[PDB]
Amino acid sequence: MKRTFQPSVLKRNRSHGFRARMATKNGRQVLARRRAKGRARLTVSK
Amino acid sequence: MIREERLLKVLRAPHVSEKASTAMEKSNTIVLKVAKDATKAEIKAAVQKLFEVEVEVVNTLVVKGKVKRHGQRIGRRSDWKKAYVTLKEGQNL
Amino acid sequence: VVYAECMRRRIVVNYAKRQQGRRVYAAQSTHLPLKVVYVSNIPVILAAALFANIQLWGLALYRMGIPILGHYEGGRAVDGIAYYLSTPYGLSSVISDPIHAIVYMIAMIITCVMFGIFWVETTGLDPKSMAKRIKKSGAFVPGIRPGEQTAKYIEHRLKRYIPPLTVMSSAFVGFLATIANFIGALGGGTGVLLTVSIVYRMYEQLLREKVSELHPAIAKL
Amino acid sequence: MKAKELREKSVEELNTELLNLLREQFNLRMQAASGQLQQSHLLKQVRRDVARVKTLLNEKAGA
RNA sequence: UAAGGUGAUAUGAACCGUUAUAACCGGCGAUUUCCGAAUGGGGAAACCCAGUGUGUUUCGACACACUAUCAUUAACUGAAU
RNA sequence: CGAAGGUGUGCUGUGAGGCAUGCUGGAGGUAUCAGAAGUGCGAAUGCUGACAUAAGUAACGAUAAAGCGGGUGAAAAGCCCGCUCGCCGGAAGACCAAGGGUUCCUGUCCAACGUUAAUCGGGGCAGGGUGAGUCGACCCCUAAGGCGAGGCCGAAAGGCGUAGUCGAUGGGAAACAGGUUAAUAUUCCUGUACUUGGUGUUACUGCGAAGGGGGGACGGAGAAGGCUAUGUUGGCCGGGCG
RNA sequence: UACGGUGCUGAAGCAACAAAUGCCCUGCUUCCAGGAAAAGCCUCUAAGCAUCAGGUAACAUCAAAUCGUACCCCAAACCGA
Numbered sequence: 053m054k055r056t057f058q059p060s061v062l063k064r065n066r067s068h069g070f071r072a073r074m075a076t077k078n079g080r081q082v083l084a085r086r087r088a089k090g091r092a093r094l095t096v097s098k
Numbered sequence: 099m100i101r102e103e104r105l106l107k108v109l110r111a112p113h114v115s116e117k118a119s120t121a122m123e124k125s126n127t128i129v130l131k132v133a134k135d136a137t138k139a140e141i142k143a144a145v146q147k148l149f150e151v152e153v154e155v156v157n158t159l160v161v162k163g164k165v166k167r168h169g170q171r172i173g174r175r176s177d178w179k180k181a182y183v184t185l186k187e188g189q190n191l
Numbered sequence: 192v193v194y195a196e197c198m199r200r201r202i203v204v205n206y207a208k209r210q211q212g213r214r215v216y217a218a219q220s221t222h223l224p225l226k227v228v229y230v231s232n233i234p235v236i237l238a239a240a241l242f243a244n245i246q247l248w249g250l251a252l253y254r255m256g257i258p259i260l261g262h263y264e265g266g267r268a269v270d271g272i273a274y275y276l277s278t279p280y281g282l283s284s285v286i287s288d289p290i291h292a293i294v295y296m297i298a299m300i301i302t303c304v305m306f307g308i309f310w311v312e313t314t315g316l317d318p319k320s321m322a323k324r325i326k327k328s329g330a331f332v333p334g335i336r337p338g339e340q341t342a343k344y345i346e347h348r349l350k351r352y353i354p355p356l357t358v359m360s361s362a363f364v365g366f367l368a369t370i371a372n373f374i375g376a377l378g379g380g381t382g383v384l385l386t387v388s389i390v391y392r393m394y395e396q397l398l399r400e401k402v403s404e405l406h407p408a409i410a411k412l
Numbered sequence: 413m414k415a416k417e418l419r420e421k422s423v424e425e426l427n428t429e430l431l432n433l434l435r436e437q438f439n440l441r442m443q444a445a446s447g448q449l450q451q452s453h454l455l456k457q458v459r460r461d462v463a464r465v466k467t468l469l470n471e472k473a474g475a
Numbered sequence: 476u477a478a479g480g481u482g483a484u485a486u487g488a489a490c491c492g493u494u495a496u497a498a499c500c501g502g503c504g505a506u507u508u509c510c511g512a513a514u515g516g517g518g519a520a521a522c523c524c525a526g527u528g529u530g531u532u533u534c535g536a537c538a539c540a541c542u543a544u545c546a547u548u549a550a551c552u553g554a555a556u
Numbered sequence: 557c558g559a560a561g562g563u564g565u566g567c568u569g570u571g572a573g574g575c576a577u578g579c580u581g582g583a584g585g586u587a588u589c590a591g592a593a594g595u596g597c598g599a600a601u602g603c604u605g606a607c608a609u610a611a612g613u614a615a616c617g618a619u620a621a622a623g624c625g626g627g628u629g630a631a632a633a634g635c636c637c638g639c640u641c642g643c644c645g646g647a648a649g650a651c652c653a654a655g656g657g658u659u660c661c662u663g664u665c666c667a668a669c670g671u672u673a674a675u676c677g678g679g680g681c682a683g684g685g686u687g688a689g690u691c692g693a694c695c696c697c698u699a700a701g702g703c704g705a706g707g708c709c710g711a712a713a714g715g716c717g718u719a720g721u722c723g724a725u726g727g728g729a730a731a732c733a734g735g736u737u738a739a740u741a742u743u744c745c746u747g748u749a750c751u752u753g754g755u756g757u758u759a760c761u762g763c764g765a766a767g768g769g770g771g772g773a774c775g776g777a778g779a780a781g782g783c784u785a786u787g788u789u790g791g792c793c794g795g796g797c798g
Numbered sequence: 799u800a801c802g803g804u805g806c807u808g809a810a811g812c813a814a815c816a817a818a819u820g821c822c823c824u825g826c827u828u829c830c831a832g833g834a835a836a837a838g839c840c841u842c843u844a845a846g847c848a849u850c851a852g853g854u855a856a857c858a859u860c861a862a863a864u865c866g867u868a869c870c871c872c873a874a875a876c877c878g879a
Contacts, residue, residue: 054878059655065519070511072519077713098521099531099538103430109437111445115204116341116684117662117739127744129687135864139536157687157743163658163868168211169681182687184744201448206682214485319800326663329682338663339683343802344738413476415496452489453481467505 068095105140106147108133113180126154126188132181134160145185154184192384195367196226202348206329206339207410220330220411224352228360230316232388234306235364239381241302242276249273280372280380296369303365307358315357318349330410417464422474425465432458 066072073079073095086094110131112123122129132141135158142153161180165173205220246268249260261271268274275294279285285292322345329337354360364384371380378386402408420428436458437444444455468475 058877061519061654063519067519069519070521074520100533100535101537103434107434107437109442109445113684115339117344117737118684120737122737138863155687155744158865159687159743159867160865162686162866163660163684166682180685180687182740182744184687199448204683208682210486212485212487214483214487216485216487328664331665331681334665334681336663336665336681337683338665338681341663341683344662344684413496413498450489453491454489456490463506469505471505 069097070095101140105133105137106144108136108141108144110178124188126186127182127184128188129180129182132158132179134177134179136179136181141181142183149185149187149190151185151187154186157182157184192367192371192387196228198227199223199225200227200352201225204340204345204348205325205412206335206337207331207412208335209330209332209410222411228355228364229392230310230356231307231354231358231361231364232385234310234361235303235368235381236385237306238299238302238365239368241306242278242299245276246273278372278381280375282377283375284373292373296366299369300362300365303361304358307361310357310361316353318353319346321353322346322349325412328412330412417468419472419475420465420468422469425469425474428465429462432462 068079068082073082083094110133112128112130113119114123118129121127136156138156138158142151142156145151145153159180159182160177162177165175167173167175201223203219203221203223205222207220208218210216211218245260249258249268249271250263250273252259253261253263258271261268261273263269263273268277275291276298277291277295279292279295323342326337326340326342326345329335329340331337355363368381368384371384374380376383440455440458449455
């Protein structure tokens with residue numbers, strides 16, 4: 053088949069890139085929980 | 099304050115090996131790791147103090163196609179230049 | 192004589208990588224020269240020898256027939272084709288006859304060019320497929336399967352390297368040999384020149400056998 | 413440790429920089445780029461040498 | 476503090492100390508790139524684009540420092556009135 | 557100089573259990589009495605790992621047919637080449653975005669991997685490759701739309717929203733034809749061109765506002781028509797008579 | 799000529815018919831549904847400054863940065879386990 057979620061990079065970084073998860077304190081929950089997990093996945097970036 | 103020796107420190111290596119070394123690394127046209135943004139300037143004027151080439155076409159291209167350097171482990175590609183200039187002379191070697 | 196193949200050219204395109212990591216050992220196949228001119232020798236042996244015949248042949252023809260190649264007296268040539276082709280050496284330079292030096296010198300150079308070219312047309316050396324000889328493989332761990340070397344796209348590398356090895360320093364060697372005699376030397380300035388070279392290809396032969404009969408030191412393809 | 417150099421002034425630190433930072437990768441770090449080093453150790457003091465240039469610039473105030 | 480050393484896998488290469496001058500430890504210092512609260516803007520940070528100063532300039536161009544917001548305070552000026 | 561265990565055999569205890577003992581094994585294990593328990597599994601379609609079956613059973617993925625002769629090599633339905641056959645062809649051609657983004661060339665390698673055979677592949681593994689004032693992106697301008705000092709709302713947290721700031725799927729300088737590597741391309745080269753903007757110089761000269769005016773600047777349909785790439789021919793020019 | 803490939807050359811090189819869904823053309827026309835914006839772009843003054851500076855024209859000069867460019871791309875390079 054052909055599935056349900058597809059690329060868009062035309063929003064990616066500004067769906068959760070650095071100033072898009074910093075942007076939110078609650079997406080700095082993400083980053084708070086990744087200053088609490090030391091996960092490689094963060095905003096899924098470098 | 100008028101130029102910098104900083105980009106007269108641009109030499110990092112001539113390319114080599116198989117095809118494309120032929121006049122691409124020799125004669126006019128030469129290809130070589132040159133800085134990282136080059137400058138298109140003191141990379142044509144640092145060979146104009148060395149061969150007097152005003153450089154037939156100053157070009158740049160960052161160099162691409164896959165990581166290696168343990169390609170059967172994980173690989174890392176730091177990225178670099180092929181100068182890929184055409185020099186206007188190549189005769190004072 | 193001995194500062195006449197000291198030089199560094201060197202090519203690595205031969206590939207290996209085995210046990211990667213750069214203080215583990217190394218990672219390549221590691222060919223080089225540093226020494227050159229190596230089948231153009233037999234030519235200048237011939238060129239000097241030809242003059243040995245003429246000085247012999249002419250003197251033989253002189254006191255048992257007709258001067259055709261020169262006039263002698265006092266043992267050696269004094270005149271003729273045989274004089275202008277005689278070698279000045281023995282203990283010191285001859286600066287008395289500059290035209291003799293010029294003709295003899297030109298004569299020897301062109302004689303050396305001649306047997307070098309006949310070392311093209313009968314018995315020489317190859318580059319084109321000496322090129323292609325190596326690449327079937329490089330050196331493998333076993334594991335890395337080369338194509339840094341390219342089986343053709345190498346002919347030229349060879350045809351830049353070889354000659355000067357049948358010609359192209361035949362001229363130069365014949366020159367070097369001639370001026371080696373204008374200085375003069377004991378045992379012959381040219382004979383020293385040939386001797387040093389013969390000795391160098393020799394010396395290493397005396398030494399040569401010992402290391403790789405442990406099965407070879409390796410990893411250079 | 414403690415026991416090196418002679419200190420260098422910033423009227424001649426000048427001269428040092430034109431020989432192991434510049435026009436040294438045109439002959440030794442060009443010729444690193446052209447290998448043949450059985451004298452690996454020499455190279456390491458092209459670095460660690462002009463790295464002392466700017467130590468004895470900021471530490472010693474150019475002295 | 477020291478006779479052995481030259482970070483690891485990484486053996487090599489070359490060297491070093493040449494035993495107190497390697498190396499180590501401890502103090503101090505230096506650099507400490509790029510980003511990043513980041514703060515000249517932009518901005519999908521590790522990047523785009525920039526200014527202002529202070530310089531240089533060969534006049535082609537080129538270095539160098541400064542330039543955030545928001546709070547608190549002071550000082551100067553000062554509408555509708 | 558043989559602990560534990562793994563592991564045979566004989567004796568024993570009701571059993572829980574115990575003994576004797578061989579091998580292997582190559583290290584440790586351990587009275588009594590006394591102390592303390594994570595102290596014993598056949599069923600939970602239990603958990604978890606290892607290990608079965610069917611069964612060599614099913615299966616080996618789209619019919620757009622290939623066939624042949626050489627080659628390589630140990631070996632070929634598939635590798636290599638060639639020669640003969642079929643099929644798509646407003647696609648099954650040829651070129652792109654996105655995305656991949658190296659999958660690419662080149663050179664190699666065959667183990668694994670490709671749905672088999674494979675020397676072969678985008679496999680595996682080495683190298684090599686994408687070059688621009690004029691082409692594009694960075695870049696200038698605007699949409700939806702966002703943000704938003706200050707501002708106006710709201711326990712905190714926090715909202716609405718200005719001056720502004722951001723923001724394509726829309727609008728802002730110019731180059732082409734040849735010719736070129738197995739990797740290049742308006743990018744390289746060649747030939748012949750193009751452009752804009754800064755500088756400078758010169759000559760003349762009133763210049764002068766986030767201002768003002770002007771202007772960008774526009775639908776759909778429909779009715780035509782014109783036109784040319786061009787297409788087709790003839791002619792032409794060359795070659796050829798099966 | 800390796801046998802991989804390289805060197806050497808060049809005739810015709812038009813016209814008719816017949817052309818395009820290509821274009822003149824944002825044209826024209828028509829119809830109501832009602833058809834961006836800004837920049838680019840032009841011009842005027844304004845305060846000012848005032849010939850100056852600027853401007854305008856010609857000419858000349860210089861500059862024209864930072865990156866992409868391989869290749870699949872209906873496909874073994876996208877997606878589909």
